[PDB]
Design a protein around this ligand. Structure first.
Ligand code: QD5
Length: 113
């Protein structure tokens, strides 16, 4: 019933949408941790100090790690910030990040107060 639980269920809804087939064409680079070794990105962990991905966010939601919506948002935005910091701004992964962030920001804005 409480405000924090209700706001966290909004976040869970967003999370579920970000991982849905509706957004899969652009969301898929954010499903799993960046495997820097597999992708040849041997400078990734020198540039990105706090890696984040939707699977980690989902793990933290399932483990009741997130105490409020603001904590959930900070992880989702960190994932996007990491993409914008590491990747050239003309790489498809950045375009895909932009589109998924647009989904995140517009539904997050509708959070029950
Ligand atoms: C969060 N993900 C990343 O930061 C990421 C970085 C790089 C990457 O190679 N970045 C280099 C600096 C350019 C490659 N991938 C895979 C990928 C994703 C999307 C389109 C693609 N087209 C070709 C590969 C590819 C990612 O998911």
């Amino acid at each position: 019933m409480g405000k924090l639980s209700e706001q966290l269920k909004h976040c869970n809804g967003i999370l579920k949408e970000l991982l849905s087939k509706k957004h899969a064409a652009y969301a898929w680079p954010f499903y799993k941790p960046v495997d820097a070794s597999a992708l040849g990105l041997h400078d990734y962990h020198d540039i990105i100090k706090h890696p984040m991905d939707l699977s980690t966010v989902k793990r933290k939601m399932e483990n009741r790690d997130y105490r409020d919506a603001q904590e959930f948002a900070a992880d989702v935005r960190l994932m996007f910030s990491n993409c914008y910091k590491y990747n050239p701004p003309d790489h498809d992964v950045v375009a895909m990040a932009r589109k998924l962030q647009d989904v995140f920001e517009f539904r997050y804005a509708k959070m029950p107060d």
